[PDB]
Amino acid sequence: SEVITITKRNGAFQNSSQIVTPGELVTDDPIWMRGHGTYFLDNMTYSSVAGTVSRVNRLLSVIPLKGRYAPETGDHVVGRIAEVGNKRWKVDIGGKQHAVLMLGSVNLPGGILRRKSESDELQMRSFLKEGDLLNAEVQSLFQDGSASLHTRSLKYGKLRNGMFCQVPSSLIVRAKNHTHNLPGNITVVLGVNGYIWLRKTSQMDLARDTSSWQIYSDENDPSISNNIRQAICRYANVIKALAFCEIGITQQRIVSAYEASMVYSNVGELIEKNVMESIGSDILTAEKMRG
Amino acid sequence: FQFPEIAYPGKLICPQYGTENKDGEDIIFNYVPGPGTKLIQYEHNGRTLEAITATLVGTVRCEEEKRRTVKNILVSVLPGANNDFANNLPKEGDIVLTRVTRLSLQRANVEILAVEDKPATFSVSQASSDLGETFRGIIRSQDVRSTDRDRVKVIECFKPGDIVRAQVLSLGDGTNYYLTTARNDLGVVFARAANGAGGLMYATDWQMMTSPVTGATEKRKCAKP
Amino acid sequence: MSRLEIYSPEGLRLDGRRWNELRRFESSINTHPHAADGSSYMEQGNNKIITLVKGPKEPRLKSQMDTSKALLNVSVNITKFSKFERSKSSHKNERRVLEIQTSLVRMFEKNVMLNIYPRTVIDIEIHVLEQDGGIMGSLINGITLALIDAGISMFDYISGISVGLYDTTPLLDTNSLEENAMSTVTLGVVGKSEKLSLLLVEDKIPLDRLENVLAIGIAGAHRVRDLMDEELRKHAQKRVSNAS
Amino acid sequence: FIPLLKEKPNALKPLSESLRLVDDDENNPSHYPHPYEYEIDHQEYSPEIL
Amino acid sequence: DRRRLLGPAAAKPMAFEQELSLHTGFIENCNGSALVEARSLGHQTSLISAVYGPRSIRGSFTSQGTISIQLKNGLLEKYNTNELKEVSSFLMGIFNSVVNLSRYPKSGIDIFVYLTYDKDLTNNPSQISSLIPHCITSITLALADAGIELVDMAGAGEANGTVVSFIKNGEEIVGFWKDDGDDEDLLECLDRCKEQYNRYRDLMISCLMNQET
Amino acid sequence: HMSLSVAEKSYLYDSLASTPSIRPDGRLPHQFRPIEIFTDFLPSSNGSSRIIASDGSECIVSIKSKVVDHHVENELLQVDVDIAGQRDDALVVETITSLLNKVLKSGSGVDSSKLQLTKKYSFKIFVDVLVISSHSHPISLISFAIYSALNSTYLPKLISAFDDLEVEELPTFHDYDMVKLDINPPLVFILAVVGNNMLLDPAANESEVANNGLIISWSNGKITSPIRSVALNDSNVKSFKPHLLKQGLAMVEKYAPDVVRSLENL
Incomplete structure (x- = not known):
């Protein structure tokens, strides 16, 4: 081997x-x-x-x-745009149908200062373009059960400075907040739909624990250290490990697994089955004798 | 003289920036890419380098366009009958000759055939009209004429097959461009009687088109020579 | 060169079975989690069938979209190595196969309300790895299991069965040799009822036989239905034990 | 808003427990908790309407 | 067959110094065309490349261009359809590096290469590998003639069944095709094909200058 | 296959194109992802295999035999590739089919002597490939499955004499008894080129940002044809320095026996 x-x-x-x-x-x-x-x-x-x-x-x-x-009203979900048509995007979330967005449900650069323009509906691709990832909140629900999304907040918007991974939606439940700060200067975004975003911790996250023109830029942080990149990879693998054992993903579980995985020198050792199974098993037993 | 007059695709012309010494002061020549050129990256001996490279086989022409002086030179490549003209694409403010494909009540969709150049000459877009690969455009009912923007009868303005000279306000979506015939020099140019079944008709009044052959008169939106 | 019979006076068949024995049944749920929303691996005798249910999801073309119901599609891939003698050509365009696909669709259109997933598409992909008689009945059982695994609502089970007839008495669950020897009847049974979703007779069958043959099939299908419930429940018990 | 409710007939939870103050979440601002929230969630519907 | 006239189905078929010629822009049906004829020894190859584009795709959201290449049998039915698809996939892996795709958003460029003829003489007491550098030569000419922006001139060579395509004056590689032949010919084939590349390159550049003039 | 935003792809490139290359997962430039292999599950066939990748990629190979006259049947080993829900005609299918047939030619990377029965008759081997699911170029995935299948294949044993020129006996095979197919199946490795780094077993996200790729065959403990450069994607394809090509061949040449060793277990 x-x-x-x-x-x-x-x-x-x-x-x-x-x-x-x-x-x-x-x-x-x-x-x-x-x-x-x-x-x-x-x-x-x-x-x-x-x-x-x-x-x-x-x-x-x-x-x-x-x-x-299934999308419930008020869920914090993470989705990737599937299609752009008319005055709306259809964003993949991971349900039976694509997410629905309305040009009036998003926030323009420069905001309040900004004046309404009829050219926005013809230039939607300059904001959300196919393939783009983003934070969003399920604003409302359609008759069939489809979701209408909105990003009318600084908390929500286009995602960058990181990597994407997904787990079964059953392993992520609703909570008071789905954005969490973790050791290693990285931040996780645990969408209720199972879509997870791991990025380098930004100032926004730091402020919570205590520029409006570039909220749709594809450009990443030009200065991202290898230590953060290697942290992202490790956090990714342990999340996949928790998912492999049908373990519900929580902020406590992730950090616990991340520090427990430090036993293994190379990060690539976390992809093997026996390693994943033991890491998840060690978490359950840890919660046993601590509970 | 430093740069070759004619460049084949892939031939190096001039570096990113340039300068010379004259009148006891350094004059900075700023080289910018143009039609037929493409700024790319080349590295020699582990050294990175950006230089203007021609992408089309043509003679090369430069033109200036805008204590210590300051300059800007435009580097481009011109080919040198058959005409292709791809660089040419409908942009906000341009004038475009179109043909009516279908008529609806609240709007009128067409297809783009040719685009007017700048100082008449035109750029013909060659495409198959029996496929749908031709660029499609939509003229709103409010963009028909400045006079009475609210209520406009589209049947009495355009007609299937009639040629319409218009100006594109905006790109719109991938399906339809935005077209306005509000001004005087815009409107139906060439048309025939009875959707093309009759004889040729000419433009007299701005809101009336007559035919000096069969004596037929049909209501259109005509432009001014 | 050889010769063979159908039913001996000793009540024994060519393979050794008696007139009323079901073949070995093995069933398997959630076999392809990373490939489909629902999946099932069927082993009914030497028959080996992979069934994948993909959906409900967004249609790839908005032209093909129903705002009142989901679009149900079924594609059966009978592999070139399903039989003993490898088939040179593909069987995909074959009129016999198009009828089978059509038949299966008609069957389940009335078995799923298909009114609660509008503006979506349910794609059912099937791969037949090995074939040995009663492939139609096995196809039915594979779809029913896979659909349930996908959490897609349906009114009841649909169990499929194969019937073999010799002289006075039909033989339950026919293999290829028996199928070759005698005419067979394929039955689609809904739940524990007497109602048939699919009645398929492709060869000549005395009219006296059918009433009794149907009676045997329905009884056998009920046993098959019971086994399927046991198969999934048993798996759940096993899975829970594994979790513990 | 302070509920005007002073009695609570058909209660599963004390009016006491019902009138209380909860510290604001960083995510969400604090609000008074509807006084029959529990009753609505856990009281059983009459057999008849069903 | 109800589409074409295949005739009687109960019948059976019949049972039994490098030199280049370049011509471009001889087809008015497309945006760019090219003719390549090569004769070496007893073996010669003549193929035609037709380019149609760039033409807009309705509803396309692609930020770059899309290249499609298809090889056809003009006369002699020799090469398998499966093998033609393989070379096509190889050819597209080359020009996707050569063609400046950023110039044609929401557009597509279709490339048709007609292998009208190849003549093979074999003495008696791979095969398509030798045609590959000629297909690359034809396409690169047809694209440059059409007006399609190319980052560099694409060319290749065939040495003992080992085909390798070069750009940036042989400094880098845009394609590699090795079938059969012999081992340890890595350094040799890279040097022999590099000479064929430079030779094919200058003749390609001169071709455009000639016709363009 | 995989759809990624411009931001994600750039980050991936930074992660992988770095001089100390890091997989998003954390793998080393020569580490493969764990796979599972099942064999001998199709009794109807002479041999069979089923390979499952870590990303859910699944491939099924079947091996069937047929007695043919090797004087009229030039190709003694035919590879057939298929995918449910996918049209047969597709560019990817035929290319892989053409490629695989060259990898397993009669007189190139396979000891066709073991298929010979008599002077006049030999065993034609049909290798049928079924790709249930795949998120990247499945060429290496299929190769591992074909290998496993061909190493657990059992063919009928001949009884009659082996001289059809003189006595000319009809080919008869003894009942029950069979002989295991002793053969050396080649392997096909696929590499990814990101900047100046070369990665073995490219993941889906990795292939999307790769500048180029390599398809290198392996047989008898050495590099062999077909060797093909391949564009893993079509938006970021760039030319590569010759030393990268020589690096790739060298990389396979030292890590292949490790793969074969883990694969040669009966």
Whole structure:
């Protein structure tokens, strides 16, 4: 395994509270209000998916074991523009449909000083261009469930000075804040949709713990040290490691894993399976004896 | 004289900056890229270097355009019948000859054929009209004429097949350019009776087009010679 | 050169099975997480099928977009090495295959409301790695499993089965030899019901036989449906144990 | 805004516990907490409407 | 076949000093064209390159140009369609470095190379590798004739089945094609093809000067 | 394949184009990503393999045999490449198909003697490739799978005499008994050129910002043809110094046996 680690296997294509089954009946009480994951016929309520039965008040629903991430109103998400059309962008978030943006839902350079122009709707590509990453908040929701985004804040906007990585959205939950400062002078942006942005800590992040013309520039910080770059790589690998073990990603978990991973000299050692599994396992056991 | 008169694509012409000694003072010549030239980077012996390099096979022409003096020289390459003219592209303020493709109620979309040059001469954009590769443009109902901008009957202004000389206010989106025929020298130039079925018609009044052959008169938006 | 029969007086078939035995069934969920939203690997006998469900997601062309329902697409890739004798040509454009794809679509259009994912597309990619009779029934089971793994809402299971007929009595779950020997009936069964989503008869079948043959298939499909529930629930128990 | 509520019939949480002051979040400014928030989230609907 | 006339389907087919000639701008159907004819020994190659562009793509958001190259069999049906696609992929890997793509945003340049003929003589008691430097020569001429901006003149050479394309006066490499032949010919092929490059380069530059004049 | 913003790509280039090159992951310029390989799962075929990458890239190879007259059948080993949800015709498919067939020619990188049955008949080997998923140039991925498959292939054993010129016996094979296909499958390595650095096993994001790339074959403990330079992307393709080409060949020449050693385990 000096150059490549090749795991082999022969003769096989691959290797290796009430129970719920399809055609199963959950209840026969007609008083219940049937929610998602269910369907009914008179008194009988059946399950439409494979998951666990959920009872909140009078609302019976079945929570699926798997599925697409769902946008709730007020979520902090990170998305990459998919398309530019008309007076809006459609930004990939990672859901069933592309995110929706309205030219009136973004903030122009120079701001309040700036005067309204009818040329903005024809020059949207100078602000958001296909492929660009950005912070955004789910402002509203459409009838089908699609999300309308907005970046009307200094906290939100185009992303730079870092690298992108993604984990299953189930491993990232809602919180008071999703932007966090970590040791090594780097900052993480944990989108609820599972899209994660790791960048060099800016002044904005520092201020929170305590230029309006260049908020859409593709240019990065001309002075980014190798120590920050090698920190980003390490934070990236440990996040992927937490994701590999189905471990919920939290700011505490990330920093804990980052310092625990210091055992391994080379950062590239964190990509191996046994290393990832142990790092995640060490975090769970650490929370065991600390809790 | 220092730089070759004619340069093939890939031939070095002149470095980034230049200077000379005259009248007991240093005159700074600032070399800037132009049509046919491209500023690129070349490194020799581990040394980085930027110099103006021609990208088209042509004779080379320079022209000045704007205590201690100050200067600016424009370096370009001109080829030297068939004409290609790619550098030419519809930009805000330019005049463009278009042809009406379809008529709607609130607007009128066309396609760009040729673009007027600067001091008449024109630059013909060669494209297939039976594909859709030709640049498309849209003339708004408010951009038809300065007189009564609110209510304008588009049927009595343009017509499918009629040639319209207009000026592009803005690029718009990838689909439609913005076209205005508000001024006097803009409007329907060449047109025929009955969507092209009849004879040729000429422009008399600004809002009236007549045909001195069959005596037919159709309402158009005409320009001024 | 050889010769063979169908059903011996000893009640034994060419492969050794009796008249009413299902082949070995193995089922597998979440096999390709990084390639699809839902995935299933089916092993029904020597049959080996990879099923990928990609969606619901944005259509690649706005021209093909429905604002009332999701677009459901199914592409079956029967590989050139699925049989013993490698096929020289591709089977993709084959009229027999287009009918199969069309048939499967018609079946599940009535089984998923497909009214809750408007302006989206559900793409179902299938790869048949190995074939040995009853490939249509196995295709049905693979899609049903993969769709459920993707968390895509549907009204019920759709189980597929293969029927073999000799003389008076049909043989459950036919292989290629039996399929070659005798006419077969492919049945699409919805849930635990008696309602058929798919009824497929391509060869000659006495009219007396069908009522009884259908009865055997429905009973067998119920067993198959029960196994599938066990297969996923068992996996969940196993996965939970692994987590613990 | 200070709720004008002085009694709380059909309560699952004390009016006491309901009237309280919470320190502002750096992310979000502090606000008085609706007094029946808990009741709305955890009280059971009559069988009949359903 | 309901598209063309293939004739009877029950029938069967038949069963049995470097010199250059350059000409450009002889086709009025496209924006740029080129003719390349080379004769060495008993082996000769004549191919035609046609360039169409740059033409605007509707709805395209690409900040640079897009090159597409396709080789065709003009007369003799020899080279496999699979192999033609491979060379095409190789050729595009070359001119994407040569062509100044930043000049043509939201646009695309289509390049058609017709291999009308190649003549091969073999004595009796790879193959397409020898044509590659001629395809590069043709395209570079057709692009320069069309008006497409090229960062440098692209040229190549073939030595013992080892093709390597050069720019910036042989100082760097824009393409490398090695098939079969013999090992340890790394240094030799790089020197032999560099001579072929410089030779093909000067004739290419002179060609434009001649026709352009 | 992967879509990245202008900012992300530049950062990646800075990370990788640095003199002490750093992978975004943290790998070294010669370290491969972990892969999983399954073999002998298709009983219907003579040989089979399945390779899974770390990014979910998956490839399945099948090996089937057929008795042919080697006097009329020139090519004794045919490689076929496919991708579900992908048209067969596509430029990438045919190029890889053409490339792979050259890598595994009868008299180039394969001992075709082991396929010979009699004076007149030999075994034609059909190598069918199925790429389920891939996020970069799958040429090296397919190569590893073909290798694994060809090293676990079992062909029927001949019974009749091996002289069709005189006695001319019809080719008959003994039942049950089979002989393992002893052969030396070549490997195909792909490299990325970012500035003056060369990377083994380029990731998706790495390939997007690369200036160029190399496809280098490997057989019998030495570099062999086909050797092809390749544009991993089409927006950042630049010419490269000859020393880089010689560096790449040297890099493969020293790290390949390590790969083969980890791959040669039965």
